[PDB]
Amino acid sequence: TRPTVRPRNDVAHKQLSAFGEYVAEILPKYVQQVQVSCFSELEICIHPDGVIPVLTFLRDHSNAQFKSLADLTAVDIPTRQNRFEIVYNLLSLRFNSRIRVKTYTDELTPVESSVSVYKAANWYEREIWDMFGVFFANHPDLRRILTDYGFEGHPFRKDFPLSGYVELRYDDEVKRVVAEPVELAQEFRKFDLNSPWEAFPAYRQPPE
Amino acid sequence: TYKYVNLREPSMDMKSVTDRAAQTLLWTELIRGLGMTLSYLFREPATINYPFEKGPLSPRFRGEHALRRYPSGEERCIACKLCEAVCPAQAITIEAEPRADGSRRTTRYDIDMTKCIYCGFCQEACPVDAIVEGPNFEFSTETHEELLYNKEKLLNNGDKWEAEIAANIQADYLYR
Amino acid sequence: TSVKPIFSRDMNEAKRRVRELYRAWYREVPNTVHLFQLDISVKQGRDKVREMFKKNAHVTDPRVVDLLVIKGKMELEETINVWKQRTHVMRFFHETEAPRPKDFLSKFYVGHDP
Amino acid sequence: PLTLEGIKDRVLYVLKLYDKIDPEKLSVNSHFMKDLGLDSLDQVEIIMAMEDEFGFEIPDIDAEKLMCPQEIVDYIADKK
Amino acid sequence: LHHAVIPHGKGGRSSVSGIVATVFGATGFLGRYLVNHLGRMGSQVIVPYRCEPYDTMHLRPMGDLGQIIFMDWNGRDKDSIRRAVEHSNVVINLVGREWETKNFDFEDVFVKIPQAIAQVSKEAGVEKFIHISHLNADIKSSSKYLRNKAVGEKEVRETFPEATIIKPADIFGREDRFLNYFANIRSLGKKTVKQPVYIVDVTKGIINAIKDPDARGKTFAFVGPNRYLLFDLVQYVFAVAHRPRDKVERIHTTDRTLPHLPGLEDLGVQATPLELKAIEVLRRHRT
Amino acid sequence: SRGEYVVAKLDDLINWARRSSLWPMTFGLACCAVEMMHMAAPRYDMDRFGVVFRASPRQSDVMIVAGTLTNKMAPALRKVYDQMPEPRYVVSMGSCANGGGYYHYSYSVVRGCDRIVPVDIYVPGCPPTAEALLYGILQLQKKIKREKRLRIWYRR
Numbered sequence A: 001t002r003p004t005v006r007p008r009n010d011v012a013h014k015q016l017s018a019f020g021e022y023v024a025e026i027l028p029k030y031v032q033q034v035q036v037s038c039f040s041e042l043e044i045c046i047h048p049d050g051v052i053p054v055l056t057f058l059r060d061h062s063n064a065q066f067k068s069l070a071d072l073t074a075v076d077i078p079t080r081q082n083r084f085e086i087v088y089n090l091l092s093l094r095f096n097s098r099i100r101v102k103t104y105t106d107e108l109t110p111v112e113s114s115v116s117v118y119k120a121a122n123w124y125e126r127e128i129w130d131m132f133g134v135f136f137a138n139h140p141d142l143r144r145i146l147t148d149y150g151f152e153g154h155p156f157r158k159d160f161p162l163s164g165y166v167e168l169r170y171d172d173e174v175k176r177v178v179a180e181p182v183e184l185a186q187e188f189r190k191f192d193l194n195s196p197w198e199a200f201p202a203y204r205q206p207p208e
Numbered sequence B: 001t002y003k004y005v006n007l008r009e010p011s012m013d014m015k016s017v018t019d020r021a022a023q024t025l026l027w028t029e030l031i032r033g034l035g036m037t038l039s040y041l042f043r044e045p046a047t048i049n050y051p052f053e054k055g056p057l058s059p060r061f062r063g064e065h066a067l068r069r070y071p072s073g074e075e076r077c078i079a080c081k082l083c084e085a086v087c088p089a090q091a092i093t094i095e096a097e098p099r100a101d102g103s104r105r106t107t108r109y110d111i112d113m114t115k116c117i118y119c120g121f122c123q124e125a126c127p128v129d130a131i132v133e134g135p136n137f138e139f140s141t142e143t144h145e146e147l148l149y150n151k152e153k154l155l156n157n158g159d160k161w162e163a164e165i166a167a168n169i170q171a172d173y174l175y176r
Numbered sequence C: 001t002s003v004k005p006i007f008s009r010d011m012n013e014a015k016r017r018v019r020e021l022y023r024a025w026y027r028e029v030p031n032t033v034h035l036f037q038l039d040i041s042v043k044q045g046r047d048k049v050r051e052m053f054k055k056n057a058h059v060t061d062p063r064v065v066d067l068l069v070i071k072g073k074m075e076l077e078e079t080i081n082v083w084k085q086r087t088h089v090m091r092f093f094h095e096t097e098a099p100r101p102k103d104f105l106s107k108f109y110v111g112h113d114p
Numbered sequence D: 001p002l003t004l005e006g007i008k009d010r011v012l013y014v015l016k017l018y019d020k021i022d023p024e025k026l027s028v029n030s031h032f033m034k035d036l037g038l039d040s041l042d043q044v045e046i047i048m049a050m051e052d053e054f055g056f057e058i059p060d061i062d063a064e065k066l067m068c069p070q071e072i073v074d075y076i077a078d079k080k
Numbered sequence E: 001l002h003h004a005v006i007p008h009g010k011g012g013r014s015s016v017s018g019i020v021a022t023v024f025g026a027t028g029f030l031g032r033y034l035v036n037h038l039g040r041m042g043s044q045v046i047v048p049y050r051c052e053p054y055d056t057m058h059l060r061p062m063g064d065l066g067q068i069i070f071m072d073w074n075g076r077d078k079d080s081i082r083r084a085v086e087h088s089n090v091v092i093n094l095v096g097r098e099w100e101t102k103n104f105d106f107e108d109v110f111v112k113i114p115q116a117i118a119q120v121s122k123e124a125g126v127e128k129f130i131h132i133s134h135l136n137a138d139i140k141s142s143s144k145y146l147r148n149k150a151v152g153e154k155e156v157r158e159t160f161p162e163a164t165i166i167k168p169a170d171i172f173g174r175e176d177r178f179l180n181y182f183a184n185i186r187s188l189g190k191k192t193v194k195q196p197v198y199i200v201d202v203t204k205g206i207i208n209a210i211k212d213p214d215a216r217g218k219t220f221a222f223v224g225p226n227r228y229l230l231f232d233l234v235q236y237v238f239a240v241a242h243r244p245r246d247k248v249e250r251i252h253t254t255d256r257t258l259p260h261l262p263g264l265e266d267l268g269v270q271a272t273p274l275e276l277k278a279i280e281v282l283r284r285h286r287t
Numbered sequence F: 001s002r003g004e005y006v007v008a009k010l011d012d013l014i015n016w017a018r019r020s021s022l023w024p025m026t027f028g029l030a031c032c033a034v035e036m037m038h039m040a041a042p043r044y045d046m047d048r049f050g051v052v053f054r055a056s057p058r059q060s061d062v063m064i065v066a067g068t069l070t071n072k073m074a075p076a077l078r079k080v081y082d083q084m085p086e087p088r089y090v091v092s093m094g095s096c097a098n099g100g101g102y103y104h105y106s107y108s109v110v111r112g113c114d115r116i117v118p119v120d121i122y123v124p125g126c127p128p129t130a131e132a133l134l135y136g137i138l139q140l141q142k143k144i145k146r147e148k149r150l151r152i153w154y155r156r
């Protein structure tokens, strides 16, 4: 078990467990999950109303500094009514630790636009608005950045397929470039690789 | 451990301040740069005469996409579809049939030279070393029709040489 | 069931914002068709604009109307700047066929399009 | 030279100048929306068309409250 | 007929459409637009050229991957022409320089070129051969151009009789000849009534007639929608453009309709006027 | 036939004059631009072939389309292509650019630069090795050696 399998530290696990229990006790208004994985990186799962209060707490308080802001994405999970998952990622300059603030959200109701306390979140929020459509009320400027202007569809969803619906070509008829419905030259074959036989017995969900 | 920069002061001693004034009004280290560049002028430049001298390489370059065959034997491929299963732009296209003999073989083995990113995964995935990334890299093709290889083009390209491919593999069949 | 809408209370503010947005598109058209050195009469462009408005008149849900207003405002900004080129503006139009009608027998000749 | 009748005459010939109205058929109780077969789209067209013709900005709720030719003339007589 | 000539699915970008078209010419104006609309249809076009490959290079990427194909032809041998028309569904004949050269007159291009290609075509077994002609090309005077075209008309009518002999009026467009000469002026003023027809309705009519069978044998003529005076049209050109011998005689010669032969209305295509497309094309003036 | 003799000799002189220097413009979107700058490197030369790398579009003899063409890129690419003198030639470098490549099945990507500009010389690879690109420019020069423009003009 020891060679070529990465060992761990239970000490960091106990530290993050006690810290997450502490944060869960002292902000009871929005805490739903505080989960700790095997390799000690914290996850805090949050209702979509305490975005500004929880981030104003987590920027400060001298027990959890966490100035460094990272990724924002809202992992598209169907079979839910609240589809999208806004994932804040926070890194502490003072304590060297990573916490993942996963707040949940639906298709049409906005979360509260974290750019007010995080100046790094501006183009992150603009990117999420362009690729998904998660609206951000009380935001300075929402535009389409990382897509074409005349293109729409919010393509990083699961409803948007791999190929786009439109496809450009130049033509000398109207002496310019026009978009057409997509005419693929090949299929993009689909390999049914989801093999049976239960490779992980621990992660079995209870069937009906 | 840290070793930072730009922590000094301009020295208030008369010699150092008149040396900085001498560099300011006398254009000194500019001429020092001219001297360094003339020292690279008087070197011999390192160029290669391209059509006569070709630049050096490794025995494991990934080029031509050639095929191999058995010693005085038939086609080395089985059409076991591993290369099309691994091809990360799906440029391989295999349609397989057996012939009148009984051993399983092909019908259509197409490499798209447009989509081919030249990984090496089809070389590493081939259990019999049928497809081999070739040695030479000169395609330079005037028409887009001609950049879609057929299996017969690959067999002609594997029968224009094997001795290069065999020498490279026989040198380096021990690393991979 | 708690749902927080964008702007709307009833469809009155929806009607108000969409008529102001159409006024903005009306005073948006001639400046752009003069600026991009286009090739289309102003009547045809305005009629295709109001046809695109009349396409989605079948929506009564107010959040959807709010999101349509926000999308139209976005593209009105991006066309009132010079950020979008001649290609996208012509791409709104359809002057390159695309000839496909909705006849049964026409789709029966060029078949397998039910 | 700015009376009610001159404003009504210039509103009259710009209603003549609008294309889809067939015919003009002016009345003090015309109600060109439903009695003449027009759309609220065409309502806001005519309202901001009068705005384009001869003056002030005519905002959204007052653009909604008119729906009628003589009521437009009287609203301009109130505002101008 | 064999498969892969039947249509397949929708249209455009290597969707396998019906016709395989051998085109003579296509480096000029109308043939280039015709290859463009067949590429929108998604039809394989076999075109031989005689010039530098740079011209067929800047009209090359109209098709999809490997759809159109380029080869060689010459105005002398039947072997190269026959090799170009070995396997063809349809074939169109568009050729002609509007001034005599050292090695070619107005005679024997319009005469000798349809003879040999119609010979190898009728010995080859092609169908729906479309031959262009200028409108009102007579036996009458004033043009070696028009009389050699009338001789070619009689040739294509006599041998291979079920050819679509087609004629537009004098077409205007992005690379017009006579509107360019209207721009390249200085002057002189005459009278002639004239109808101009825009180029895209003409080539839409040609592709619709070549893809729609049962409309064969009949010669067609395309009609301009306005049909007014030439000098009023010149005033219109100078007004929209902001500034105050063979070609000029062949535009002053003859412009009439013929009630014999059918035109646009038996095809079902909308006519674009002079005014709209003329405002579209009259760029390149002072600012 | 000394008329034909003068035509052939003058055509040889003018076409050798064209193919002699051929200064390009480096359009260069993605990492194929880095490999083009590596055939700008001191080992694989460009001085020897009269080839001067130059960002000027107004004087571009040939144009090396390299990188990955996108839908947002394409109208600006053809606007770069238009303000260019009519004697011009195109080298499509890179698997991305000569047929879509590794991003062939995607949105926002034109399936190769064939659908925008005509292509004289395709050179594949990822990246096409600077040695191989220099070979492709040599076969471009041999295409310039076979052009027969003045022959066609004389016997036209």
Ligand SMILES: NC(=O)C1=CN([C@@H]2O[C@H](COP(=O)(O)OP(=O)(O)OC[C@H]3O[C@@H](n4cnc5c(N)ncnc54)[C@H](OP(=O)(O)O)[C@@H]3O)[C@@H](O)[C@H]2O)C=CC1
Pocket (backbone or CB within 6 Å): E024, E025, E026, E027, E028, E029, E030, E031, E049, E050, E051, E075, E094, E095, E096, E097, E098, E104, E109, E132, E133, E134, E135, E167, E168, E169, E170, E171, E172, E177
């Ligand atoms: N208003 C108009 O201009 C009208 C024109 N037409 C007819 O339409 C046709 C096309 O017109 P247009 O495009 O303007 O003119 P073009 O001269 O450009 O078209 C003729 C084509 O055939 C080629 N060609 C001509 N003569 C020869 C030759 N001797 N040897 C080899 N190739 C030759 C031309 O050049 P290349 O060899 O380089 O390919 C070109 O590709 C003409 O026949 C014209 O009479 C009909 C009605 C109206």
Ligand code: SF4
Pocket (backbone or CB within 6 Å): B076, B077, B078, B079, B080, B081, B082, B083, B084, B094, B125, B126, B127, B128, B129, B130, B131
């Ligand atoms: S992996 Fe090798 S043997 Fe198998 S199909 Fe590919 S080339 Fe043939």
Ligand code: SF4
Pocket (backbone or CB within 6 Å): B083, B086, B087, B088, B089, B090, B091, B092, B111, B115, B116, B117, B118, B119, B120, B121, B122, B123
């Ligand atoms: S090297 Fe080319 S053919 Fe081989 S797996 Fe990669 S893309 Fe496919």
Ligand code: SF4
Pocket (backbone or CB within 6 Å): F030, F031, F032, F066, F067, F068, F094, F095, F096, F097, F101, F125, F126, F127, F128
């Ligand atoms: S072909 Fe390869 S090297 Fe060139 S742009 Fe594409 S990914 Fe980069």
